[PDB]
Ligand binder design. Structure first.
Ligand SMILES: OCCNCc1ccccc1
Length: 117
């Protein structure tokens, strides 16, 4: 029943509000946990600016733009890419943000994406 892509609206969190600053301790774990939280509706997004990544925990999970032509509704097509110690696991387009668990923080916006699953 699982489609290749799912439309999600992700809460955009300010980095200083985030209570759980990463998904886990290895590349494989963070990707796994990020995908589960995305399915459960408990994933937030932090937009990357100077100073943001040092305030979060590695490995990082990024959502990156996967294509240039399809934004049905306002949902940019994205895929997950993890980073640890300067090495990325996946190759994709431009970063839309870094994913983190969402545990009830108040967002500043919602970001519509079409997530490749
Ligand atoms: O083992 C999967 C259970 N999820 C634990 C968790 C992680 C981050 C925020 C809230 C809860």
């Amino acid at each position: 029943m699982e489609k290749t892509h799912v439309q999600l609206s992700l809460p955009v969190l300010q980095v200083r509000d985030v209570l759980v600053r990463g998904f886990g301790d290895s590349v494989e774990e963070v990707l796994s946990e990020a995908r589960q939280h995305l399915k459960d509706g408990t994933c937030g997004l932090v937009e990357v600016e100077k100073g943001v990544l040092p305030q979060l925990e590695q490995p990082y999970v990024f959502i990156k733009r996967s294509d240039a032509r399809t934004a049905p509704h306002g949902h940019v097509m994205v895929e997950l890419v993890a980073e640890l110690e300067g090495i990325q696991y996946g190759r994709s387009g431009e970063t839309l943000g870094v994913l983190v668990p969402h545990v009830g923080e108040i967002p500043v916006a919602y970001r519509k994406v079409l997530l490749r699953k």
